[PDB]
Ligand binder design. Structure first.
Ligand code: NFU
Ligand code: SF4
Ligand code: F3S
Ligand SMILES: [Mg+2]
Lengths: 270, 602
């Protein structure tokens, strides 16, 4: 009996669903066919409208306290909640309903974890992270915009294997993926340590792969697996391809000034 | 209430049907229709059911940062907004990017096209044409034989292979946990494929799911990650170094470029051997069943900005040449100018926003985004529990874009109709799309029917293209064309680098101290779903206004001040439903637009 997953979508750009299906180990195909039962998911599901809604009740009844609720995106509180409408009602109402009988809740990505782009100032919809509306259920934050594919499927794999949520840090993120800052293991670190920096795009330093700190890299304050696990089966990550980390796994990263403004007090990151 | 517009006779006196949520799209949509005594759709209402307010959030921020914000408009068409943004800012600040940056952006754009199109067809659209339960009844041997007729060059064709796939599907279904297939409309008479065709398609569904993750590694190389690769105002961040000292030292070296070429070659094989043949075969069989519905506005009014100039910054050389066609006159393509205040305008008469004067449409440089969620007095239900939306008032988070007041369809089909019209007018740059269309017509009319022992037909492109089948075909053809194009782009990039031009960024105007104190710019992109534009105003180094008009904004638009309907609503009109309580035909046609609702509303 494969564990049912009800995958809800709030205000979102769907980057988290898209990342999920990039997973190479394990393949998304194998997750859906062999590991979970993906019973409700707007992106992929055959049923629509009334037939789709009916699935929620059926699973919540048969598998009470034994399904995982995955949330992509987040609920808005402004516009009476109707800046995200599902089945003619506010998304927040669907979220609260399905959450109540979940065994565990996964907050996919920075949207569900922190608010992400729609929650950036002045947050016209009052988009709100899941843990600020659902306060009485086991939640795990898997932040990033989106998270790395293998991090997403890694979390699912752990939860299925062990029937437990993995060890979390104080911010509710899995330590197995979010214990390191990008800057800890970044391959450009030897340049940082030697004060070798890119100062303008495509300068000689950039062509030599010098550190991107002075171009605004937020690696030194950002927890994620990008510098080691890397992206799309270990092909690259933002810094390897020449752009500074913009801090996309961290709470409120859209409102920490320009992405191209360097962190102050460089000495504190040495 | 009933009225006529654009040759459609709207009537809301029939039975009301609601589809909410519409699934297998990106984002959130509600669709309502009315059907007559014979189950024919006589009214259709498109409601975008989400809004985030990116245009509001951008105000006051640094134009150099904008691309990263607007990229998060959509993770499916990931990067298309970033491209529009950097183009808009570069337009405003008079920045010319280096050739390598142009080519790398083009390669990234065309990679997105292929990934988006192929994933759409198989993983979002196919279940509207393909009955998975029927696939379980197929004979593996006859499936193998069908595969060899549909695509002789595809190597995965053995009876044993299809048998193995079928067996896993059966175990899956027999487990009692049907997952994404739960509560499906399987068995409906709306499904016309033979079992063998269904098994072939489901097989390719699984193949595509495994393969799509490889294609995007092109994004990862140039842009660090996918979804949401990085861009840069003034060029690209992926600096180039081929010397020995550039051995994994620089973002881009020859090894990285070789890797990219290998991915491109695989894409070209998939499009040619799997995607295009599948769509031709499925199209042919639904054509034979007489399902040529869903033309909507495609039969009259189509628009695209034009894209992919073989010579940078020279629009006459667009390889997907754009413009506007009206009234189904393919003999006259009007030029489209995104700078012209009288051309692209957005109304909000029936949208949840407010203007100073809502009797007029605003050009995006003068655009305004102020939310106004309010329901008409004839709504059934309440503000937070809608039973039946009131389309006489404001009924969507999507604005209503029009061109010189006309409602237009946008997307691959529009681009292919435009390319065909250009080609006939003597435009050589459109030769390849024309060739694709003529090839496809012959396959659908004659070649595939003969192969399958079916009657030959004699539909012209004029008759065949404006349809849900045509819309689906055009998307596949565009994927193929894009793969072919970026193959050439790769060669041009490598040639330029080896000639000694390694520049990837123009930083002359990177610092805001160099900017004009006021500026306006526009960037346009041929996004996977159609015509995308970003319009920016800059003042004292900050964003004064930022307005997006996005392909699904056009297609999914609600009615305008004149009461004209948009592409979604037009496409559903005049379509019979087998069972009003199963939205199979509604989904099939809506999905043929590849609706991106997060895009549409931003
Ligand atoms: N509509 C839309 Fe997107 Ni998610 C844009 N621009 C694209 O193809
Ligand atoms: S500042 Fe950024 S590029 Fe430099 S070593 Fe740290 S993480 Fe790497
Ligand atoms: S931008 Fe995000 S993808 Fe990793 S390198 Fe920084 S946390
Ligand atoms: Mg807009």
């Amino acid at each position: 009996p494969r564990t049912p997953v009800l995958w809800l979508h709030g205000l979102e750009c769907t980057c988290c669903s898209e990342s999920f299906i990039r997973s190479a180990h394990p393949l998304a195909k194998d997750v859906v066919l062999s590991m979970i039962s993906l019973d409700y998911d707007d992106t992929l599901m055959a049923a629509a409208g009334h037939q789709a809604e009916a699935i929620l009740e059926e699973i919540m009844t048969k598998y009470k306290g034994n399904y995982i609720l995955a949330v992509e995106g987040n609920p808005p509180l402004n516009q009476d909640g109707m800046s995200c409408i599902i089945g003619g009602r506010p998304f927040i109402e669907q979220l609260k309903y399905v959450a109540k009988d979940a065994k565990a809740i996964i907050s996919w990505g920075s949207c569900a974890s922190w608010g992400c782009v729609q929650a950036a100032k002045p947050n016209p919809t009052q988009a709100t992270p899941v843990h600020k509306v659902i306060t009485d259920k086991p939640i795990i934050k898997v932040p990033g915009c989106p998270p790395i594919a293998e991090v997403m499927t890694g979390v699912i794999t752990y939860m299925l294997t062990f029937d437990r949520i993995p060890e979390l840090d104080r911010q509710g993120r899995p330590k197995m993926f979010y214990s390191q800052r990008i800057h800890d293991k970044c391959y450009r670190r030897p340049h940082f340590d030697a004060g070798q920096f890119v100062e303008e795009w495509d300068d000689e330093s950039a062509r030599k792969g010098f550190c991107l700190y002075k171009m605004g890299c937020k690696g030194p304050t950002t927890y994620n697996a990008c510098s080691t696990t890397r992206w799309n089966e270990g092909t690259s990550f933002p810094i390897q391809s020449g752009h500074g980390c913009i801090g996309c796994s961290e709470d409120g990263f859209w409102d920490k000034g320009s992405f191209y403004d360097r962190l102050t007090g460089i000495s504190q990151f040495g | 209430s009933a009225y006529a517009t654009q040759g459609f006779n709207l009537d809301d006196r029939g039975r009301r049907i609601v589809v909410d949520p519409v699934t297998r799209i990106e984002g959130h949509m509600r669709c309502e229709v009315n059907v007559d005594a014979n189950n024919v759709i006589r009214n259709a209402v498109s409601t975008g059911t989400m809004w985030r307010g990116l245009e509001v959030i951008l105000k006051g921020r640094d134009p150099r940062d904008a691309w990263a914000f607007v990229e998060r408009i959509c993770g499916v068409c990931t990067g298309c907004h970033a491209l529009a943004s950097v183009r808009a800012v570069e337009n405003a600040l008079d920045i010319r990017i280096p050739k390598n940056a142009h080519l790398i952006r083009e390669i990234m754009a065309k990679t997105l096209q292929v990934h988006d199109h192929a994933v759409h067809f198989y993983h979002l659209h196919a279940l509207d044409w393909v009955d998975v339960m029927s696939a379980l009844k197929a004979d593996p041997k006859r499936t193998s034989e069908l595969q060899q007729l549909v695509s002789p060059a595809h190597p995965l064709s053995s009876a044993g292979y299809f048998r193995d796939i079928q067996n896993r599907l059966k175990r899956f279904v027999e487990s009692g946990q049907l997952g994404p297939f739960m509560n499906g409309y399987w068995g409906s008479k709306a499904y016309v494929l033979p079992p063998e065709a269904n098994l072939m398609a489901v097989t390719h569904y699984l193949e595509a799911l495994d393969l799509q993750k490889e294609w995007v590694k092109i994004h990862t190389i140039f842009g660090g990650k996918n979804p949401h690769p990085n861009y840069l105002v003034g060029g690209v961040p992926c600096a180039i170094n081929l010397d020995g000292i550039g051995a994994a030292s620089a973002p881009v070296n020859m090894e990285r470029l070789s890797f990219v070429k290998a991915r491109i070659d695989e894409i070209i094989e998939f499009n040619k051997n799997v995607y295009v043949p599948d769509v031709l075969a499925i199209g042919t069989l639904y054509k034979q069943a007489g399902w040529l519905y869903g033309g909507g506005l495609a039969a009259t009014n189509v628009l695209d900005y034009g894209e992919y100039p073989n010579v940078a910054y020279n629009k006459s050389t667009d390889q997907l040449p754009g413009g506007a066609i009206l009234n189904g006159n393919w003999d006259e393509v009007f030029p489209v100018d995104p700078r012209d205040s009288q051309q692209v305008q957005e109304f909000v008469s029936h949208s949840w926003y407010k203007y100073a004067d809502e009797s007029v449409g605003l050009h995006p440089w003068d655009g305004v985004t102020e939310p106004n969620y309010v329901l008409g007095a004839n709504t059934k239900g309440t503000r937070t529990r809608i039973e039946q939306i009131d389309e006489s008032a404001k009924y969507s988070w999507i604005k209503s874009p029009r061109w010189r007041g006309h409602a237009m369809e946008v997307g691959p089909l529009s681009r292919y109709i435009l390319a065909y019209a250009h080609a006939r007018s003597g435009n050589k740059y459109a030769e390849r799309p024309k060739e694709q269309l003529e090839y496809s017509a012959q396959m659908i009319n004659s070649a595939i029917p003969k192969a399958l022992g079916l009657p030959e037909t004699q539909y012209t492109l004029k008759q065949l293209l404006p349809s849900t089948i045509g819309r689906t075909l055009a998307r596949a053809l565009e994927s193929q064309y894009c793969g072919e194009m970026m193959h050439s782009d790769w060669h041009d990039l490598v040639a330029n680098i080896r000639a000694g031009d390694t520049a990837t960024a123009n930083v002359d105007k990177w610092d805001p101290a160099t900017w004009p104190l006021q500026a306006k710019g526009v960037g346009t992109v041929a996004a996977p779903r159609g015509a995308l534009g970003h319009w920016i105003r800059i003042k004292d180094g900050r964003i004064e206004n930022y307005q997006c008009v996005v392909p699904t904004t056009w297609n999914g638009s609600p009615r305008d001040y004149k009461g004209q309907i948009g592409a979604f609503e037009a496409s559903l009109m005049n379509t019979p439903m087998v069972n009003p309580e199963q939205p199979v035909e509604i989904l099939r046609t809506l999905h043929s637009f590849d609706p991106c609702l997060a895009c549409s509303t931003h």
